[PDB]
Design a protein around this ligand. Structure first.
Ligand SMILES: OC[C@H]1O[C@@H]2O[C@H]3[C@H](O)[C@@H](O)[C@@H](O[C@H]4[C@H](O)[C@@H](O)[C@@H](O[C@H]5[C@H](O)[C@@H](O)[C@@H](O[C@H]6[C@H](O)[C@@H](O)[C@@H](O[C@H]7[C@H](O)[C@@H](O)[C@@H](O[C@H]8[C@H](O)[C@@H](O)[C@@H](O[C@H]([C@H]2O)[C@@H]1O)O[C@@H]8CO)O[C@@H]7CO)O[C@@H]6CO)O[C@@H]5CO)O[C@@H]4CO)O[C@@H]3CO
Ligand SMILES: OC[C@H]1O[C@H](O[C@H]2[C@H](O)[C@@H](O)[C@@H](O[C@H]3[C@H](O)[C@@H](O)[C@@H](O[C@H]4[C@H](O)[C@@H](O)[C@@H](O)O[C@@H]4CO)O[C@@H]3CO)O[C@@H]2CO)[C@H](O)[C@@H](O)[C@@H]1O
Ligand code: NA
Length: 446
């Protein structure tokens, strides 16, 4: 008994905001229906790209109108971007026919498409961007320059540490001449004192953005999408893992219940360890050897990791599915967490290794991996007398920075470099090799 409707794209199908003259646009039209003559049309929902609504009106001829400014707003939200790029909008109208008794009968109709291009954004300032706010002092001399990210050239960053929350604005370099700031040239938020921490940048009578946080923060500015975030930039200085295999952390402080990870050198909130996991072991991590601000399964885990180790979520615990030795890599800055499981590749480096310093992190310099939960990684026998160096190298760390995660043996213990400088040299002789028990924390050269 089912009714159909046919919609078509309205006459304003290709909107260029720079050029747009009207304050309302026609975006769609009901062209025909199999509903009887005399029926009224009611609109149960009008959505854009599936989950966005917008105020709308419908004319006597069943043309659907919206305010251009709100269509433009909704388009920029949908795409999280003010970029001046042609954006597709898919319009879904769910309508009903209404009889003289008031009964609504559902129309099954199609979707239609239009596009809209947001207005031209400011030019990128060749000399970059500055932050000025309560925390700096509102003047040219106090303005702090944002760092242009090496990987993404649209992205500018400032890390700061502040005593209380702060209002601030972003200025292009050309707005600032000596101590003088041209206030008319601010970039900021739509609302003065916006405390969302994550919103659009405005270039038109911009208000001040509020940090919403204090302490260590990071202010990010995307000068292509024109968006900003302000994020908690503090990080744990230590990190510990407990587990089903460790009595779930009882008692507190016990090196028996809590395993320290090793800080990555000079690298905020990032840690690593080499650990044995059985199948179905569950673990969680904490910033001390005890429960509190602990975490387990999180969202930023590689598909790689998940495949390599068979990882899954088990009531918020992290569950390891495939037994084995793994290099565990963990990063925590403010709220953002990353956990990676990787091959436990330990490498001989330097003078006692293959072609010396000249081939680094190569297959020959790889330590054999034990099958047991208490065996020993063993290096390739030394090719020469020289100083022994040993490392891992996580994906996230460049090969040049192998020394950020290096260690050695002193007095039959594994001594991690961690955040410290070069370790005291330890000599080996030709045909010797290293033995590591990561379960014990002990080792030998022999
Ligand atoms: O919650 C704490 C305070 O909140 C409010 O203070 C904020 C703002 O909300 C925030 O935007 C930002 O302010 C920045 C501006 O963003 C930045 O652009 C720059 O401001 C310059 C203006 O842009 C220029 O237009 C020019 O301003 C003129 C202004 O147009 C004139 O009207 C005149 O401003 C007078 C006011 O008229 C007076 O009423 C008086 O305002 C006092 C209030 O009386 C106080 O209650 C208090 O209010 C604060 C909120 O405004 C809260 O404490 O302080 C204001 C003054 O800040 O005095 C002002 C100034 O004498 O003269 C202005 C020129 O002097 O030039 C200004 C640059 O001076 O800098 C602003 C910061 O200084 O940050 C704040 C503070 O966190
Ligand atoms: O035999 C006892 C139980 O064994 C298993 O429970 C484990 C959990 O699976 C582990 O996750 C862990 O629980 C921690 C928890 O992870 C940690 O957050 C903290 O819990 C806080 C919680 O964050 C807070 O919101 C509030 O509710 O207080 C909680 C503390 O009570 O501490 C937990 C440990 O106390 O360890 C337990 C074992 O103790 C198994 O899943 C259970 O069904 C079983 O009963
Ligand atoms: Na080598």
């Amino acid at each position: 008994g089912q009714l159909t409707a046919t919609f078509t794209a309205g006459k304003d199908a290709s909107i260029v905001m720079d050029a747009a003259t009207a304050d309302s646009v026609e975006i769609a039209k009901l062209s025909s229906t199999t509903a009887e003559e005399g029926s009224k049309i009611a609109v149960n929902s009008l959505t854009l790209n599936e989950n966005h609504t917008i105020p709308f009106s419908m004319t006597e001829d069943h043309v659907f109108k919206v305010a251009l400014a709100q269509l433009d707003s909704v388009t920029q939200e949908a795409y999280k971007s003010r970029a001046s790029v042609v954006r597709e909008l898919k319009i879904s109208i769910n309508a009903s026919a209404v009889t003289p008794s008031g009964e609504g009968i559902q129309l099954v109709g199609n979707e239609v498409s239009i596009t809209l291009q947001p207005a031209t954004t400011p030019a990128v300032d060749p000399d970059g961007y500055y932050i000025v706010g309560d925390f700096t002092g509102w003047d040219g001399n106090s303005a702090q320059q944002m760092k242009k990210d090496a990987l993404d050239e649209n992205l500018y960053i400032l890390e700061a540490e502040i005593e209380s929350t702060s209002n601030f604005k972003i200025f292009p370099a050309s707005a600032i001449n000596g101590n003088d700031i041209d206030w008319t040239k601010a970039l900021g938020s739509s609302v003065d004192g916006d405390d969302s921490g994550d919103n659009f940048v405005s270039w038109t009578n911009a208000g001040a953005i509020n940090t919403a946080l204090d302490g260590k923060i990071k202010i990010s500015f995307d000068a292509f999408n024109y968006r900003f975030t302000v994020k908690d930039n503090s990080a744990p200085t230590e990190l510990y893992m407990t587990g089903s295999a460790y009595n779930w952390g009882t008692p507190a402080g016990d090196p028996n219940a809590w395993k320290a990870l090793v800080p990555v050198n000079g690298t905020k909130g990032t840690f690593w360890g080499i650990f044995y996991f059985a199948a179905n072991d569950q673990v969680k991590f904490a910033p001390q050897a005890n429960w509190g601000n602990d975490f387990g399964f999180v969202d930023a885990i590689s598909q790689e990791s998940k495949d390599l180790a068979g990882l899954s979520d088990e009531g918020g615990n992290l569950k390891v599915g495939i037994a084995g030795w793994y290099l565990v890599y963990v990063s925590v800055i403010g709220d953002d967490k990353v956990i990676e499981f990787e091959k436990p590749n330990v490498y001989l480096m330097g003078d006692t290794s293959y072609n010396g310093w000249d081939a680094q992190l190569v297959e020959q310099d790889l330590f054999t991996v034990p099958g047991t939960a208490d065996g020993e990684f063993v290096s390739p026998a030394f090719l020469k007398d020289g100083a022994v160096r040993i490392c891992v190298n996580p994906k996230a760390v460049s090969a040049g920075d192998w020394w950020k995660t290096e260690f050695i043996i002193f007095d039959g213990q594994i001594a991690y470099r961690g955040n410290g400088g070069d370790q005291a040299a330890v000599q080996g002789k030709t045909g010797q090799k290293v033995y590591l028990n990561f379960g014990n924390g002990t080792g030998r050269i022999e």
